[PDB]
Design a protein around this nucleic acid. Sequence first.
DNA 1: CCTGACTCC
DNA 2: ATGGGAGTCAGG
Length: 579
Amino acid sequence: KMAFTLADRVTEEMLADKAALVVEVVEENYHDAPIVGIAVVNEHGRFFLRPETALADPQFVAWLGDETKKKSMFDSKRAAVALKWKGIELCGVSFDLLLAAYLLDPAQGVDDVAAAAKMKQYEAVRPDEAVYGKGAKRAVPDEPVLAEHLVRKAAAIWELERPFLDELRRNEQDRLLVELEQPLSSILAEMEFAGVKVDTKRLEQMGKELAEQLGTVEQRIYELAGQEFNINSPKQLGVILFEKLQLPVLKKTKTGYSTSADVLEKLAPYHEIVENILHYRQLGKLQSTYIEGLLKVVRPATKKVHTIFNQALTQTGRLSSTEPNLQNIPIRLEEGRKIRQAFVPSESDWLIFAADYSQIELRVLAHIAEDDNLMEAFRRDLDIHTKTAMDIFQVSEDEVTPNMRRQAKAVNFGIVYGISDYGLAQNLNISRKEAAEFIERYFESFPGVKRYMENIVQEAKQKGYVTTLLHRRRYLPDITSRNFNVRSFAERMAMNTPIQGSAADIIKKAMIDLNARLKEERLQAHLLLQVHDELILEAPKEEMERLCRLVPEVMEQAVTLRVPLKVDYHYGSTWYDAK
DNA sequence: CCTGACTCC
DNA sequence: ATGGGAGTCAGG
Ligand SMILES: Nc1ccn([C@H]2C[C@H](O)[C@@H](COP(=O)(O)OP(=O)(O)OP(=O)(O)O)O2)c(=O)n1
Ligand SMILES: Nc1ccn([C@H]2C[C@H](O)[C@@H](COP(=O)(O)OP(=O)(O)OP(=O)(O)O)O2)c(=O)n1
Ligand SMILES: [Mg+2]
């Protein structure tokens, strides 16, 4: 039973200095998406406004953009970006219920106001999907039904703010929300709306050449197989490998023979065709995802792509990137890495600038574990990825290739995060006995890491959750399970989540600090992407010198640990050349 | 619609 | 049974 005004025009009482605000965008991808309705709840009452009315009203636009007029919202980034596409600036967001719910418990997967409301037994609001429908049936409902929904969402935010803030405070997470996540949200909104420019001429030419290449590789595979088949079907491929060619079956899953890359690599001594197939599947992913998939989402008039950074999704505090994912662009193989040549500055005589934290989760672990040897390694500015490489490959520091260092990187993180002898052995294609002895020596080098991992598992059993440096939390209710697999996975989340999450806390803080410095120094430079422990910027070529000092400094000083933080940086004419 | 493939941190 | 965190794709 909820009264509200379906307003025909904006009135002064709608423009109070505190309000719950709903700016509704139904489409999952909110870039250039319709705003279908607006709701405002404040001390004076409850109001629904039509966007064509409200958004062309100069007082309402003024109010949206006035930082002293405070708004509580759910997913303020979605509203901010949708408004930027409407040419309107949103300021003064003081509470975001999505971010509040996320910090209280990321496992709730809260994706609408109703699911957040449930956390406090508030039920005077419906789920979005129940209002709009799903798939081909998704639609905006009749105005009265829409209006009531948006108003109930705003009223929920109005009533839920204090109970959420109260609980965050009890958890010592209120500052994490107000000083970190909420300011980051506005920064991500800027990055997403800016977008990254793409060289479509180059990408399309790449794609044409790649198609010819796939054809050649495909026919070679059919020749080796003695038959045509769909190489992109693990079922058909399994029949070829394990029935026609009679190769050993190393692994099965629930649907049939495994053809994972791990398995095919191990079959190379039996038939050369597995190497061709691995190459083919790489090339096919390049074409489907990083050529075709990317071209499909380029906005043609500006040649820009606009990702969405999901800030309330991952269980550790990382961001994710969708439609397109710009956090998994190829780099490890030169063939794939060339895609990066198609990511270019948005203005002429600008350049791309990239900065990456050195050995980040190993520095974080040194600090949190207080491992004397590892802490001293970072004080000696050593490279643990390179050192591990020299060992596993029996090679000098000068003969270690970037590829070797990449592999050693997975060995280091594998070991500290609980890899077994079976897994390490399968990884380095070495003897299981050899792998076990290697793990043993690793923890004899870093015994504090070992103690830390034993202890954090016990603490997680006792408390039911683990925490990061800035008080981010993950609950682990499975960790005392009688079941071995269920318990074991939970134990390994206790080992990993605090470290990966603390690293996420750090780069989030650096983005805030960096933008503040950019503004203070009046630089045109701005952030384009975050890639977990990297920041990618564009700026006039004349700003590179400054950035070379400023960016790494801000990143390195974002937090003070018991070890130095270190940042590598590069710049060039394209994302590829920023190395 | 899921599974298993390739991509990154 | 067998490091952890992610997203997109073709095939079925
Ligand atoms: N009410 C609070 C207090 C702290 N924090 C988060 C953000 C802070 O940046 C981080 C660190 O807190 P402090 O700097 O105040 O140090 P603490 O006293 O909390 O010690 P510790 O972090 O070891 O628990 O914790 C928070 O979100 N809300
Ligand atoms: N196989 C991997 C690779 C990375 N990561 C995590 C831990 C890494 O510290 C972090 C960053 O990825 P990087 O590739 O940037 O690795 P580093 O920062 O550790 O090393 P560097 O930047 O010096 O190459 O992501 C991981 O858990 N497992
Ligand atoms: Mg790094």
